[PDB]
Amino acid sequence: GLMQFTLPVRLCKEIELFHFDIGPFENMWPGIFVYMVHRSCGTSCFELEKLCRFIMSVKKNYRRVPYHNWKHAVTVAHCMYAILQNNHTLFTDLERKGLLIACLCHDLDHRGFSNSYLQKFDHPLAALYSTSTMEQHHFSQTVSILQLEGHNIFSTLSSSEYEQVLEIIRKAIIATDLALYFGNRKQLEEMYQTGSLNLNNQSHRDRVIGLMMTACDLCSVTKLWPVTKLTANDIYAEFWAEGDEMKKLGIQPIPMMDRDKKDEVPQGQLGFYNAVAIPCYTTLTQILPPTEPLLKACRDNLSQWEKVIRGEE
């Protein structure tokens, strides 16, 4: 009960900031997550024994892929932790419980391939899940782990509170399908501007949580430039591998996934920042003003990619 997780001074201070990098020591990442759970939710939210056994099962079920790996899971959870901590009173107890878990589990058993490649490969999962293929799989893996003996971290919740939290996690993980982001932010943009956005309306809370999940999932672009730049290498390592696999199916991949077209990457990043990243953090900042530092960092990184195109680096 009285066993608190404590980090070294530099981590204790920087973990509160949006642009925190969780560092290269894999064996510290579980403690970093438990720390965030305790501060964000409370020490009483989860039985420490069950939480630690849940975390280590989740870790085992992420693969050794360049980007969609255990470090991404913890990185996304940290961005969520910084959003919740900066928006103390806006979220219920169930939401703070569910959302940190959702982020940790949002990419469980990712193979480094997109929904499009699964579809064109004719992968079994594309037969079982027609849309949001990988994200339905990620939620399925999450339920599977929660049902392992000694792994049900939500055991102390009532039947209705257990169903509510598992529904928050399901919608939260499905929201990380980027195909669904574009419509979700447009609807939120309309609701904000026409003034009809209501945080007591559950349908509106769902959309706002969806956008939060996109914000955390893309948070590679909200880091200090050296982290953003080095993470981009891991991102493109997965894209170029999928491109190779598209060429093996006899399909020319989109330039984003063609390793022959690396020269085009800097302009590709501008498109992504202007079409996905900047819009996402702008709407988030409109709804949740204290998340402004994600937008600012994102704009700083947009400017660094412009400098790359201009040959200044």
- Nearest partner of 92 among 44, 147, 41, 136, judged by Cα: 41
Instruction: Supply 253's token pair.
Output: 């991949």
Three-state SS for 240?
Answer: helix
- Residues 107 and 68: beta-carbon distance below 8 Å: yes
218 binds, among Mg ion, Zn ion, ligand IWC, none (CB under 5 to 8 A by kind): ligand IWC
- Residues 77 and 103: beta-carbon distance below 8 Å: yes
**Rg from Cα positions in the chain:** 19
- Nearest partner of 98 among 206, 247, 180, 236, judged by Cα: 206
Shorter beta-carbon distance to Mg ion: residue 141 or 176: 176
Residues 85-124 interacting with Mg ion (rule: CB under 5 A): 107
**Least distance from Mg ion to the Cβ atom of residue 179, Å:** 11
Does 206 appear as a known binding residue?
Answer: no
**For residues 219 and 72, what is the distance between their CA atoms, to the nearest angstrom?**
10
Q: Does 242 bind Zn ion (CB under 5 A)?
A: no
Residues 253-282 interacting with Zn ion (rule: CB under 5 A): none
Residues 98-117 interacting with Zn ion (rule: CB under 5 A): 107
- Nearest partner of 32 among 23, 41, 42, 19, judged by Cα: 23
Q: Does 255 bind ligand IWC (CB under 6 A)?
A: yes
Three-state SS for 114?
Answer: coil
184 binds, among ligand IWC, Mg ion, Zn ion, none (CB under 5 to 8 A by kind): none
Q: Does 23 bind ligand IWC (CB under 6 A)?
A: no
Q: Residues in the site for ligand IWC, rule: CB under 6 A? A: 218, 220-221, 235, 255-256, 261, 264-265, 268, 271-272
Q: Which residues are catalytic?
A: 68
Q: Residues in the site for Zn ion, rule: CB under 5 A? A: 107, 217
Residues contributing to the annotated binding site for 3',5'-cyclic AMP: 68, 269
Residues contributing to the annotated binding site for a divalent metal cation: 72, 106-107, 217
